[PDB]
Amino acid sequence: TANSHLGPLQISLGRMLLDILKFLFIYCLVLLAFANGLNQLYFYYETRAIDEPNNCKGIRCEKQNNAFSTLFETLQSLFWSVFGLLNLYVTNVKARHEFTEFVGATMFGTYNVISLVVLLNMLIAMMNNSYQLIADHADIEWKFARTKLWMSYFDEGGTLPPPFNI
Amino acid sequence: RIPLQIVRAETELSAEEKAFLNAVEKGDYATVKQALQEAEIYYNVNINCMDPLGRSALLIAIENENLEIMELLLNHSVYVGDALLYAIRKEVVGAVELLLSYRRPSGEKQVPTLMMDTQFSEFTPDITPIMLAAHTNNYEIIKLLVQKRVTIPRPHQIRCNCVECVSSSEVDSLRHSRSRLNIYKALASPSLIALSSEDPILTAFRLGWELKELSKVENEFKAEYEELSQQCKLFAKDLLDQARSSRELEIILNHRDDLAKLKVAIKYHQKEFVAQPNCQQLLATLWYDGFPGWRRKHWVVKLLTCMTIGFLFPMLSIAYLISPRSNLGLFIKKPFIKFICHTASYLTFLFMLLLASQHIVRTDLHVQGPPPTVVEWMILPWVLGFIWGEIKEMWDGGFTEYIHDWWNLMDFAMNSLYLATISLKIVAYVKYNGSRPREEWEMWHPTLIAEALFAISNILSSLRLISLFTANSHLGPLQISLGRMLLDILKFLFIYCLVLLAFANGLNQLYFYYETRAIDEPNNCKGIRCEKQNNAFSTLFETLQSLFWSVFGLLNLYVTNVKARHEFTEFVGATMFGTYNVISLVVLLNMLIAMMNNSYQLIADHADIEWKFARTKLWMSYFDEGGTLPPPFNIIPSLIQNQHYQEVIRNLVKRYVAAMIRNTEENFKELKQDISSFRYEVLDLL
């Protein structure tokens, strides 16, 4: 708020953060639904850490282990798939159950299509519209925030810095 | 240079006729009276003479609103053809009164014969005075015309196949379309609806629905039909807005041919009528029937009451079963308690579906036909209650109304998935006895198919919670914009499916000779779902899957490499894959972003009205007594009204007419004409 260029930017950031929260509610609901479906489909094929290479179990290995074995692991794997850090061979099982693998791949593809084609672009559209409304009033609220910050230092309470106030 | 000439012959007006028309334009009464008195004796001036702009003396008198010169030109028996149309379009009450009242008296010897004045008419020949008065929307002229026993032709059905409509359309389609549009414009005026209809609200609703259907049918004239439907809807909302007491509002809403008129408005898609503030207040009062002052409370006590009433789901439904006339059983009949109990039941079903996917209950997975666990035995009554509720919703209300909701498709899909998984489980129990290990099971095992359908049904059950977003005040317009953008996403996905099919066909046709067997490849797997990505363009299905997965970047770049050193084919395939990637990631997705962005801006202004309409549709679903019990418990075994409505509509019509009466170069010309006429009369008298 002290600078004359970074104030309205963070005011628009504050409005768009509320819009991001309104988006993230629906995203959390969709993520919970798809994580429940993926865990219910894939939790029979859980393997122990000793059988897998390098004695590790999870999506944080060199070779990506069972990603849909638990609800927490399924939630982490569905979270990391938005940024593309989850590979495609996590939906493959040891046995040759082609129908279950195809159904899980369809499930993962539908979640990817939703969270990367509908939801993120809708969030972009919402925060775009919000900015246009925010810009006309951006100055007044920036001046109000700067006035609120300026009068916080007007009083004598808190003259000393944090290293010297004690 | 370029010569210029008058291509089309306009006859020049004589000096006397030009002076007479100029005197009529300036409003000099004495000179016009002298010219009219000299016209009969000497025949010098044709009184019905036109001007360069197509107006006669009578039309010039009408446009300047000189009633004195108007009656003086009428007294000498000038031509009067179509002057009433100009008076009605000018919205002059006195001119319309004079033209109506003077045409009858003192008609002697037919009319004086006149020729070749009748070609030029600004108004179309199909037009009649009552229809043009309806288009003008003036009230007094419409009233004076309706008092003289005037009628309007009835338009036919849109899907009319009689001989006369087809013959008129074939002979002259333009005249038929103009006549139908003029008739519907005359019928859609608020003044004619207020004056010639005993039920203005229902007439406005039916006219708005008919105009919307005509706009859907007639492609050429869509815009004015949409404007007429919007005008009828705004007239209905404005007539509803003129109420002054709660008794008048409840009389209007509860009038029948409980809230019958609100249901009729919802059936005709009158969003402005439903979303009016007083109707919303009445629906809020009916919705919070047993909880007075709900808006007053701080949010912690409201959330605590919601938690204590949602956690009390298994009671208050058996209490209704055992004692519906008791004090405790009567609390479930209120709509808010019904909605909270249904939400608590669905949340309990979702939590039970989460609990079914845990290792505490699931044991002994190496059985071919496994008996259902106790969690499944308890989940089965909820599925049966959902089936009974969906079939009851199919029966009550009709099959023609069950399909218009658009949420029933997911319910039908969920019920089909539950029936399929139950049938697969029972068949696996009955004829797959054994304990074979899962690693050597058949790929087409009904247990695996039943579990896959169960997982898809669990996803649909968890995604069913989006429909409850209308209840909140923040998630309603968000999903309305989501619903519009989903249609825009479908319009995008058509072109994306076409481009994907084209590139998949090209890639499969290029790469299907180099298919390899699973034994030769490492780890005995074949497809894009391996640790090392195998042949991705060997089949049409595999090519479609590989081109689908390349949008999210999960397909690597070495899938376009073959075993042999065919560098040209590899380069051509890499160019093909790169062109598909450039299209689907630089043109199409950004165009989809631009389309849904534009749509949101249009959606936002109307977002509230439609959110209030959706919330009103959700609120009245719980008003009726059909479906009081939850899904786990639903399977357990008079002319004074018309007179008051007429009184209220009478007062509302009077108030709306007063409001609309309360709410350009022609105008200043009146002031020049009034000043000029007063100046000539003062000079003449003095």
Add this chain to the structure above:
Amino acid sequence: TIPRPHQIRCNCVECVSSSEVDSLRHSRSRLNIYKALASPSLIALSSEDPILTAFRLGWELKELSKVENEFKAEYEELSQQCKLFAKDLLDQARSSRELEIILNHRDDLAKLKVAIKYHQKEFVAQPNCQQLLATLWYDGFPGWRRKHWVVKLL
């Protein structure tokens, strides 16, 4: 005289009885009373402290718009009208002494703190109040806006 509106969270017998008997008449009467009280002319003529009265009426209208869902728009319009009336009355000053008298009046900058507490962004963001706050902010550094940026950064 004009009747006094009740509290928004009013639970007396007469308000509840009027709401139950005829909610539309009660809502129309309350909206008409608050529209009458929110006019700038009546505030200028019948209030000894127009700025504080406009601030309180704007805060009450904003809270009523937050409470009453049906009539949100006209209550927001009334709050905006009261805020614009307060800013327009502040804008009519002609000297620095009048501005410091208005800002420092108590029932140091008490009225500015009262405006900030009531969320009067237009009143706080007026140019003369911003100039006075800038002068108080650069108390020991006269002519701070004058300087080239290198000496300011140094």
Add this chain to the structure above:
Amino acid sequence: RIPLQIVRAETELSAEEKAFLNAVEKGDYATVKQALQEAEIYYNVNINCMDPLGRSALLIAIENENLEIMELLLNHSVYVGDALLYAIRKEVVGAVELLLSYRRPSGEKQVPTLMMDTQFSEFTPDITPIMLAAHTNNYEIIKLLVQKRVTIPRPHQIRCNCVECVSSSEVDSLRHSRSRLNIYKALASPSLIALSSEDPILTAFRLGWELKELSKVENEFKAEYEELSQQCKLFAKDLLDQARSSRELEIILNHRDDLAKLKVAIKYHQKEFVAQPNCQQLLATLWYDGFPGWRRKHWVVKLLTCMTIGFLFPMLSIAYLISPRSNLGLFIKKPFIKFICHTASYLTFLFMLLLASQHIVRTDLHVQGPPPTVVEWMILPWVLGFIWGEIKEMWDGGFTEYIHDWWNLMDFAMNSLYLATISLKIVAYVKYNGSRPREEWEMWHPTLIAEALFAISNILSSLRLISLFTANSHLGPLQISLGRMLLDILKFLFIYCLVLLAFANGLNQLYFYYETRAIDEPNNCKGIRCEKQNNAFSTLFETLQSLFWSVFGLLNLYVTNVKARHEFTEFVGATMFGTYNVISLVVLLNMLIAMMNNSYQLIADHADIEWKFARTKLWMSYFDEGGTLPPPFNIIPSLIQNQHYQEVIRNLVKRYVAAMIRNTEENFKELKQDISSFRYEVLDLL
């Protein structure tokens, strides 16, 4: 209930005073004359009495424009204080003439004494009549005031540190700011500039620049200063637009204190003046000096002429060196041929830099200090010519003008890189004799550093071609929008750098205990640039690089895994990395997209004007004779004008005044007043 009372005492007007004010409002001359004649004998009515709204009888006469009642109230010696301000604000020429001319005659015995009328003044006490007339922008009142020997105070410098300005700012800052704003508003009126300045264009340019600098300085009053600068710029463009012949335009542009006034307009950033169509036509005619009818031609012959003149780069510059007075040497002095030759030279330099990176020329890479290849020997004269051209541009024009271009920073960087690579090459030649193989070279070898600087200079030389986009008609506004969005990208990248530094500090503080040596890890490499991604959060620089590369998805997920089984630390680091990814890929990038989207919509309306300004700035850079030779060849060793300008500005001022003269409830009140005054006089006479 609530009692209501008049808090502030307004004295009620008596019956006679109220009747007198009502008679003055209705314009009845006889009743007002009778009341004024009875006022002296009986003293019944205070003629200077006010009303409830703060107007007197004279102000009511001024507002209704009743000149008769105005002079009648003046004849009885009413109070006249500040009435001239109301007349000037009302823009009544006759009222201003009457108030100017009546104040002098018939003043006897001071004025009659009057008290307590003087508190209420709508106009501020600092205001004077000439200043308010300048604010009103009326021409006749300004002319009549200027004829009576009236002056305006001179504003001080913005960076004024004298005693009186500082004392006035300290004593009363609001009065000083209002006085300065009123003075600059008075000086910025087009009528005062046209009437009181011998050079309206230069005065408007200086006033616009001063108003823009004041808007940059004064933060509180930025908007009206920007409006005043826009008004001055539009006045200058409108005065330029009133020309009628090419000789007047060339007289205006070529007037000095060749195109001196165009250079002065460019120096003051008058984009509207430069982008006028007639000045653009004159600049296009001067630009295509030797190619008449360039716009006429089909594009194939234009491209063929461009190719044949761009391929003829090595001739026509040596011809200028050997025979500047010849027919062939004179063709290089035209601006279009100069621009095409410079573009051909830069394209040849870029093509030579492409050819330098081929295996045909580069041989024997295992030499420590390699001699320069023949391609480098030929490229060296181009670098020397670029150095000589940049230093010549530094000398000519001044050091204060060389830094405002903003393209010279890349030229300075390119010259520094070329000097550094030449120095590294010469030092490696002089003291690194040998043929050691490249696999065992020092990491700080000057040959490798020289090649890295050469590659960066080659990138800068290839990216220097963006500046030529102003010449085309399609790539100019695109790069103008790119320039605005680059500033918006910088405003985004500040917050992104802060967030990146915070998350990098947290990740390094969490993960720097688990650093491993390069010998223990596979392949003897350590960092995120291995086949297997090594420790990515071991150092602050490595953490910054890893967090930078995670935005594009090139950083894998197993970098947050440690050797030991510390599951809590790994989960905390994964949560940290996920939170940084969610921020930098869901909030920040989409917010940057929204910001640059909004900016483009604002940029598009003005995109042309600024593109034409940039093209005009590029065109006049080649007009002068300084820098005729290309970079490869530049190192090879009078009062009639003022009278005509005054005549043209005189005709332009007259035409602009005629144009501005050619181009509400007060108005209708005049018509009610004129009708009411005529009605009373007719009734009185009759």
